[PDB]
């Protein structure tokens, strides 16, 4: 079973790859913007050569244009796709959010994942599990009130949520399992190791498409 994970160099992404590298019969395509600086992940891949380290910047269309061939070097298929790489840089009031923050969150957090999926769709189509996870945020819900504003961050997660919902409908006949997942705050904060563990078991047990899920397996409103 081939897993693909964007942003595997640090955070939850690293913790998810750490966990898969201990699981027998798991090939892992792990991405980093800058693999030669990805010390922890390059070490992970040397001690566990089933872990393949590939370049991806999801903000960079030229990098996304290369991801299908970069993945194609190591596998004929993807079972479980995880769009994890993302940014969270702008919060607070709309009047105080400049153009560049709106633009950056759209390109990195919405366009990136849509283009990434478009490029890797043929490889996912040939796999067995056809499981597709976009790492989202509960802040992206149009129906939760945290007593906070999330500015471009929140808008970006809501935009990708909208398209994830549509993708779930569109791919249901091809028996794809498409989910948006809040990995927790790494609300009580959790360790990347804890988010990873919960995410892993969610990834294995999820059998229906079109869900918006917290890491604990409970549903969120869109």
Ligand X SMILES: NC(=O)C1=CN([C@@H]2O[C@H](COP(=O)(O)OP(=O)(O)OC[C@H]3O[C@@H](n4cnc5c(N)ncnc54)[C@H](OP(=O)(O)O)[C@@H]3O)[C@@H](O)[C@H]2O)C=CC1
What's the min distance (Å) between Cβ of 209 and its own copies? 14
H or E stretch covering 115 = helix 112-125
Instruction: Quote the CA–CA distance of 2 and 4 in Å, as a whole number.
Output: 7
Instruction: Quote the CA–CA distance of 104 and 60 in Å, as a whole number.
Output: 11
Instruction: Quote the CA–CA distance of 209 and 173 in Å, as a whole number.
Output: 11
Applying CB under 8 A, among 39, 76, 94, 217 the residue interacting with its own copies is 94
Per-position x/- string for 78-97, each x denoting binding to ligand X as judged by CB under 6 A, each - no binding: ------xxxxx---------
The burial of 121, by beta-carbon neighbours within 10 Å (0-12 exposed, 13-18 middle, 19 or more buried), is given as middle
Pick one of ligand X, its own copies, none as the site partner of residue 221 (Cβ within 5 to 8 A by kind).
its own copies
Applying CB under 6 A, among 11, 19, 106, 149 the residue interacting with ligand X is 11
What's the min distance (Å) between Cβ of 219 and ligand X? 15
Applying CB under 6 A, among 42, 48, 50, 59 the residue interacting with ligand X is 59
Instruction: Quote the CA–CA distance of 97 and 118 in Å, as a whole number.
Output: 30
Number of Cβ within 10 Å of residue 112's Cβ equals 26
Q: Is 178 helix (H, G, I), strand (E, B) or coil?
A: strand
Question: Of residues 38-77, which lie at the interface with its own copies (CB under 8 A)?
Answer: 61
Residue 97 touches its own copies, criterion: CB under 8 A: yes
What's the min distance (Å) between Cβ of 8 and its own copies? 24
Per-position x/- string for 154-183, each x denoting binding to its own copies as judged by CB under 8 A, each - no binding: xxx-xx-xxx-xxx-xx-------------
181 with 213: CB under 8 angstroms? yes
The candidate with the shortest Cα–Cα distance to 199, out of 47, 5, 48, 54, is: 5
Return residues touching ligand X (CB under 6 A): 7, 9-13, 33, 56-59, 84-88, 108, 135, 137, 182-186, 192
Which residues lie near its own copies (CB under 8 A)? Answer: 61, 93-95, 97, 99, 102-103, 106, 110-111, 114-115, 117-118, 121, 140-143, 149-151, 154-156, 158-159, 161-163, 165-167, 169-170, 221-222
């Amino acid at each position: 079973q081939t897993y693909f994970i964007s942003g595997a160099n640090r955070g939850i992404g690293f913790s998810v790859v750490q966990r898969l590298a201990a699981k027998s019969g798991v090939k892992v395509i792990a991405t980093a913007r800058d693999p030669a600086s990805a010390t922890a992940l390059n070490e992970l891949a040397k001690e566990n050569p089933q872990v393949k380290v590939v370049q991806l910047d999801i903000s960079d269309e030229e990098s996304i244009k290369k991801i299908a061939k970069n993945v194609s070097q190591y596998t004929d298929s993807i079972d479980v796709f995880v769009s994890n790489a993302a940014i969270a840089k702008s919060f607070g009031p709309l009047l105080n959010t400049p153009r560049e923050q709106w633009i950056e969150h759209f390109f990195t957090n919405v366009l990136g994942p849509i283009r990434l999926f478009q490029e890797l769709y043929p490889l996912i189509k040939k796999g067995t599990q056809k499981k597709v996870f976009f790492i989202s945020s509960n802040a992206g819900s149009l129906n939760l009130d945290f007593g906070l504003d999330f500015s471009a961050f929140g808008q970006s997660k809501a935009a990708l949520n909208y398209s994830t919902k549509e993708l779930a409908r569109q791919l249901k006949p091809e028996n794809f399992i498409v989910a948006a997942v809040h990995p927790g705050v790494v609300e009580t904060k959790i360790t990347p190791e804890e988010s990873a563990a919960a995410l892993c078991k969610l990834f294995e047990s999820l059998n229906t498409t079109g869900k918006y899920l917290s890491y604990d397996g409970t549903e969120l409103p869109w």
